[PDB]
Paper text:
Co-translational folding is a fundamental process for the efficient biosynthesis of nascent polypeptides that emerge through the ribosome exit tunnel. To understand how this process is modulated by the shape and surface of the narrow tunnel, we have rationally engineered three exit tunnel protein loops (uL22, uL23 and uL24) of the 70S ribosome by CRISPR/Cas9 gene editing, and studied the co-translational folding of an immunoglobulin-like filamin domain (FLN5). In E.coli’s 70S ribosomal particle, the tunnel’s unique geometry is shaped by the 23S ribosomal RNA (rRNA) and the ribosomal proteins uL4, uL22, uL23, uL24 and uL29. Of these proteins, uL4, uL22, uL23 and uL24 all have extended loops (ranging from 10 to 25 residues in length) that protrude into the tunnel, and along with uL29, have surface-exposed globular regions that crown the perimeter of the exit tunnel.
Unlike the loop truncations, the extension of uL23 and uL24 loops showed opposing effects in modulating the CTF of FLN5: 23+L caused earlier folding while 24+L delayed folding. To investigate how the uL23 loop extension promotes earlier folding, we analysed both 23+L and WT RNC (L = 34) structures by single-particle cryo-EM. The electron density reconstruction of 547,000 and 614,463 P-site tRNA RNC particles were refined to an average resolution of 2.5 Å and 2.7 Å for 23+L and WT RNCs, respectively. Unlike the uL23 loop in the WT ribosome that primarily interacts with 23S rRNA H6, the extended uL23 loop interacts also with neighbouring H7 helix: the guanidino groups of R73 and R77 in the extended uL23 loop form contacts with the phosphate group of A90 (H7) and the ribose of C455, respectively, while both uL23’s T81 side chain and the G83 backbone are in close proximity to A64 of H6. The 23+L cryo-EM structure revealed continuous density corresponding to the P-site tRNA-bound folded FLN5 NC, which extended from the PTC throughout the entire length of the tunnel and beyond the exit, resembling the WT RNC structure. Notably, the folded FLN5 NC densities of 23+L and WT RNC (L = 34) both show only the H24/H50 pathway, making clear interactions with two rRNA helices (A1323 of H50 and C490 of H24); they do not follow the H6/H7 pathway. This is seemingly a result of the short linker (L = 34) that can only follow the shorter H24/H50 pathway to accommodate the folded FLN5, while RNCs with a longer linker (L = 45/47) can take either of the two. Unlike the folded FLN5 NC that follows the H24/H50 pathway, the available cryo-EM maps of different unfolded NCs with similar linker lengths (L = 30–40) all show their NCs primarily on the H6/H7 pathway irrespective of NC sequences, revealing the likely interactions between the unfolded NC and H6/H7. On the 23+L ribosome, however, this interaction face is occluded by the extended uL23 loop, which is highly positively charged and interacts with both H6/H7 rRNA helices, thereby reducing NC-rRNA interactions and eliciting early folding.
Numbering used by the authors:
A (entry chain 6): 1 to 46
B (entry chain c): 2 to 272
C (entry chain t): 1 to 101
RNA sequence: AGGACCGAACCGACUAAUGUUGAAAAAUUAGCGGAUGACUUGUGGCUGGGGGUGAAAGGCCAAUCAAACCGGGAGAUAGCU
RNA sequence: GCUCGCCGGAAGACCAAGGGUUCCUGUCCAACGUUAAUCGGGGCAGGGUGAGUCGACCCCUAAGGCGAGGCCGAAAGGCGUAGUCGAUGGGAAACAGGUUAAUAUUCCUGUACUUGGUGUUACUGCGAAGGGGGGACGGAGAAGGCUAUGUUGGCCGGGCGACGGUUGUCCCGGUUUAAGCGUGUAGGCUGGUUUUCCAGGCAAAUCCGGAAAAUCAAGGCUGAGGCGUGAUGACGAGGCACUACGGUGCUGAAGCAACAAAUGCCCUGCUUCCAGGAAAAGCCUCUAAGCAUCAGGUAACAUCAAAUCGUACCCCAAACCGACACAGGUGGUCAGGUAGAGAAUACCAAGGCGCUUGAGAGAACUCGGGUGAAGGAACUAGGCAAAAUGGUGCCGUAACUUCGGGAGAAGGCACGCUGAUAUGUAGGUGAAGCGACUUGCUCGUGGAGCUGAAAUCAGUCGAAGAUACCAGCUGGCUGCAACUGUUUAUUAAAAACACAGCACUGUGCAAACACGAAAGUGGACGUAUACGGUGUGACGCCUGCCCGGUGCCGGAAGGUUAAUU
C-alpha cells in the first residue's frame, strides 16, 4: 500500500527549507523559536 | 446542416451535430493567435468562484476585431473558420492594403464577399457604420455600447438587434432579451445577423460531450446534507422549503439587478 | 596568470595506491591530492612549475569522506563519537614525456 | 465511426476462502469489472480549518475528521467516579 | 565441482526518484542475521567514482511564485506593473574496440565532431530591449518503403559417437564490425524566376503582406533506408604456451546470400473527425538611431579555450516508502527461440535464483488440492462454494425492437498424422539473362532460387485430434435505474450520485453571482443561440383541479410607521 511519506528533495526544500522559512515573518518566527531552544538543526536544509 | 447520428451505440443515439462544409479545414491564421490557459473557475485567491468549470479541450484564442476601425478600406473575405472561443464562427478578411483580421461572420457572408466600415459604407450585411447612419428598423449585430469601445451586444450565434427609434443623440434598440435600451447614436454596428443560427439545434448526446466543453457535473442541492446546502437532508426525498441558491438567496423569481447608475438607459425591462 | 603563492598552495600530496602505481607505469599518469578548490588550470600550472615536467591534461574528481567512529574519554568515562572525514580532491595528471618522483 | 465489442499491460474492488497476538494497522489466493476514454500515469504548481475540496458518502484534507494538527489561555470546569 | 529444481514481458538487464559508501579487497564473529556461521548489506582497516561531446549548471520560457515604483489595507499585510525566477517542455557537438578487484561514450587505441576567442589573408554594409519568418505542436485510422531482429542455406573450424544405427540430404560452434564523411532514393510538401507599384507589419525596410505585368512550369525544400569509405583495421570459433590452475600471454579460419520482420524509423508525414489541438529563446532575415577609407560582416587558414559540480553501489528492492533482511507500494527503458492472434499461456535461451531454522514421523483436527458407487439441489436464508461451458471455420438462429440491436441467441458438424492433386499448390518475394532510356539508388520483360497457407480425395492410430496450459454456462418471467460512468481510502458499488434531455427563474455587461474590510480576481479576453441558480432525469404517450396558507412578483389610493425637526 501507498504510505503517506513519498519523499522528494525539491518539494522538501521548497516547503520547509531555510529560504522558505525566511520568506515570511511567521516562518522567521519559527526560526527564532528554534534558535531560542538551541536546536542543532534549524531546518530541513541539508 | 443538422445531422442525426445512427444509434450504433448508446451515447450516439441522440447526438445531433451541426456540420458546415464551408468552414476551413486547415490551421488558423498564426499571427492572430494567443495562448488561453484555463482557470477552473478559480480566482487569484485560488478558490472556486464559479462552479462546474474545468477540463475540456485545449483552446487557442483568436484575436477578433470587435472595433472595426479600418474605415474606407475595402476588405474581401478569404475563408470562414471555426472558433472554439464562441458559438459563432469567424471570417478571415483581407484588406486592400494587405492586412488581415478576424471578424464575426454575419449570416449570409461567404468567401469572396466585400465588406467595408465607416460613415460612407454601403448598407449591406457585414458592413459597419455608426448607428447615426443606419436606417431605423434595420437588423444589426455586434453593437457598441460606448463609441470606440468595441462591439458588445448581439455577438452570439443567431443573435441580432433591432433599431426601433432614433431620438436625438440616442437610438433605441430591441435586444434579444426583449429589453428596450438606449445607446449613443455614435456607437457602431454591423448590418445583418450573426451566422451559425443552427447552433441551438445541436444535441450533445452524452455526458462526455459536455465534459470536453469544460463543464463539470452539477450536484443537486437537495441531494446533499444540511451542512452543504440549504436544501439539506431528510430521510428519503424531502424538500419542505423555498428554493434558494447555495448561499441562501431565494431563486425562482427574486430579482437581483441593482444598478442605479444605468437605470436611465433601460426604456423597458424584458418580459 | 596564476600567482606563485596559489601554486604553492594547491598541491597537497602524492596519492599512493596500486591504482596510482598502475596508472604511473601504464599511462605516465601522476595521481595527487590537491586543494578541494583547485581548478584544472591551477593544477596544470602547479605541476609544470613545482615539478618541472610538461603536462598533457588533468582529470579531477572529488572524494566524499566516510563516517569514522571512535571513542573519547571525558572525565573517567568513555563516550562514543561519530563524524565524517573531510572531502578531498584527486587529480590524475598526465605527463607528456617527463619522469617524476 | 464508437463515453462500440472480446481480451493482456494498466486502473479498479463484486463473491468466497484464508488470515484476525496477520507475511500485512485492509493483504493473499481463486474467480470478477473497465480496458480510446466522463481513461490512466510521472513531474511541478494552487486551494487551509467554520476553511478547502467533494459525479454528494458527513466522503477526503499525512494510518486522525459532524470541524485537522501543534503550541498557548490552562492546573478550563467536573453537584460525577 | 557435478547433478536436480524455479523465473524468463522476469524473479533478467539499464536508469530516474529516494538512499547515502550499502561498492571492491583484507581481516574478525561479541552484538546484529528469527538457527549455526568459517558467511554477510554486521565490526575494523585499506582502496574505489577520471568527461569540450552523458547529466547538471547555463540560454529560453509554462502553470505558478516573488515583485522597484503603484493601488489597497487599524498594524501585520493583500494584489499587482516593469521585471525576475520557475521544468515535468524547446537551445551546440563521440562512436567502435580494449582495460580494473572495484570507473568508463570519462582511462587507452583508432577514427570523429561542436561552439567560442584571438591573429593572418581575401572580399565586403554593417548595426537593435524594434519588424517578419521559424521554432510550433490534437485525436483516430490506413498504407507503403525500410531497419533492429530472427530463421534457413552457403562458407569455415571441429566431430564420427559408453546402447541398435550414424562419411551423411549427419552432429556442434562461428559467420560481428559503429559514429563520422560521400552519394541522394522509397516517400512528403510546394509552381518557379524577373520587373513595377503600396491606405498594412506602433518608424522603415531591399524582409513579410498585398496588387499588376512578362516569361519558363523541366525549380526548390525535406527525407528513412541502401551503397561506398571508415576498415590491407578491430573482433573472431579454436588452437599453441605458462600457471600460483586463479587465470594470463601468442596466433587466428570463414566472416556471404535468401526469406521473414516489428509496437522502432520515413512520419512533426498522409487521410479523416471535431471537442479545433503551449510559450519564449537559440536559428534565418529586414532595417532604425549610429558608424563611415574605422568598426563590424563573410570565407579560408592558424592557434588557444571548453571551467565547475555529478559519476561508486541498490534501484519492482534485504540499500527507496511500509517501526522488521516485512508475501504490500514504486515512474521510464530493452525484449531472444518453439507453439500461439498475442507483451496471454506452456516449455526454454542469455542471465538470475532455490525465498537464513533443520531432521524425522506419516494420529485427530485445520489449511490447499485430486478422485469418487447410486442419486442429482433432496443442501441452504440463497446452487454459497464447487462442478460445468469454453477455440477456429461453416450451417442455423425466436419473441421483442428506439431498426442499430436481441445474437456467439439457442442448436449443430469438421478438426490429429501420412500420401496425392502439387517430388511445395494459390499467393508472396524475386536473381541472372535480356530490352529500352533521360544511361544508374533506371525502366520493361523474364523466371532461377527462397517462402508458403487453405482445400479436396485416399489411407491410418488411439477410449479420446481446439487432446496439455489457455478458453463464454444457457434459456424463461418480473422490480428498479435509460445507457458508459461516480461513491461511504479501511464492513454498504446500490434502486444512491452524475448524465444527455426538459422546465422555471435570475442576468443588458463595470452582468447576475462568488472569493475578498479593500484593491482586485473569477464569471470571460464570453455577452441573452450567453452565463448563474434551482428542480426533473434518455426515449415514447403525457403532465388534470386548487392562489384560501407560506413564499415570490406587481401596485399604491388610504391606515400605521425611524432617525430628524
Amino acid at each position: 500500500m501507498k504510505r503517506t511519506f513519498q519523499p522528494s528533495v525539491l518539494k522538501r526544500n521548497r516547503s520547509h527549507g531555510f529560504r522558505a522559512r525566511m520568506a515570511t515573518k511567521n516562518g522567521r518566527q519559527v526560526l527564532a523559536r528554534r534558535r531560542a531552544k538551541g536546536r542543532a538543526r534549524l531546518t530541513v536544509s541539508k | 446542416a443538422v445531422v442525426k447520428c445512427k444509434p450504433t451505440s448508446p451515447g450516439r443515439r441522440h447526438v445531433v451535430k451541426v456540420v458546415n462544409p464551408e468552414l476551413h479545414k486547415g490551421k488558423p491564421f498564426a499571427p492572430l493567435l494567443e495562448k488561453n490557459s484555463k482557470s477552473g473557475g478559480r480566482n487569484n485567491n485560488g478558490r472556486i468562484t464559479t462552479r462546474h468549470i474545468g477540463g475540456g479541450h485545449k483552446q487557442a484564442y483568436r484575436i477578433v476585431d470587435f472595433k472595426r476601425n479600418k474605415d474606407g478600406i475595402p476588405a474581401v473575405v478569404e475563408r470562414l473558420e471555426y472558433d472554439p472561443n464562441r458559438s459563432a464562427n469567424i471570417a478571415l478578411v483581407l484588406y486592400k492594403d494587405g492586412e488581415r483580421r478576424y471578424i464575426l461572420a454575419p449570416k449570409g457572408l461567404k468567401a469572396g464577399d466585400q465588406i467595408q466600415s465607416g460613415v460612407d459604407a454601403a448598407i449591406k450585411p457585414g458592413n459597419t457604420l455608426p448607428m447615426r447612419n443606419i436606417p431605423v428598423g434595420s437588423t444589426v449585430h455586434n453593437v457598441e455600447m460606448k463609441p470606440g469601445k468595441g462591439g458588445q451586444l448581439a455577438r452570439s450565434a443567431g443573435t441580432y438587434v433591432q433599431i426601433v427609434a432614433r431620438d436625438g443623440a440616442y437610438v433605441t434598440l430591441r435586444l434579444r432579451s426583449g429589453e428596450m435600451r438606449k445607446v449613443e447614436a455614435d456607437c457602431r454596428a454591423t448590418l445583418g445577423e450573426v451566422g451559425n443560427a443552427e447552433h441551438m439545434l445541436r444535441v450533445l448526446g452524452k455526458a462526455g460531450a459536455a465534459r470536453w466543453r469544460g463543464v463539470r457535473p452539477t450536484v443537486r442541492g437537495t441531494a446533499m446534507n444540511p451542512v452543504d446546502h440549504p436544501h439539506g437532508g431528510g430521510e428519503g426525498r424531502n424538500f419542505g422549503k423555498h428554493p434558494v441558491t447555495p448561499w441562501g438567496v431565494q431563486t425562482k423569481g427574486k430579482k437581483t439587478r441593482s444598478n442605479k447608475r444605468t437605470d436611465k438607459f433601460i426604456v423597458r425591462r424584458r418580459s | 596568470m596564476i600567482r606563485e603563492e596559489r601554486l604553492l598552495k594547491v598541491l597537497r600530496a602524492p596519492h599512493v595506491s596500486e591504482k596510482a602505481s598502475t596508472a604511473m607505469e601504464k599511462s605516465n599518469t601522476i595521481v595527487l591530492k590537491v586543494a578541494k578548490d583547485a581548478t584544472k588550470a591551477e593544477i596544470k600550472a602547479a605541476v609544470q612549475k613545482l615539478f618541472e615536467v610538461e603536462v598533457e591534461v588533468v582529470n579531477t574528481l572529488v572524494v566524499k569522506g566516510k563516517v569514522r567512529q571512535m571513542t573519547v574519554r571525558s572525565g573517567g568515562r568513555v563516550i562514543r563519537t561519530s563524524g565524517r572525514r573531510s572531502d578531498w580532491k584527486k587529480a590524475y595528471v598526465t605527463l607528456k614525456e617527463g619522469q617524476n618522483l
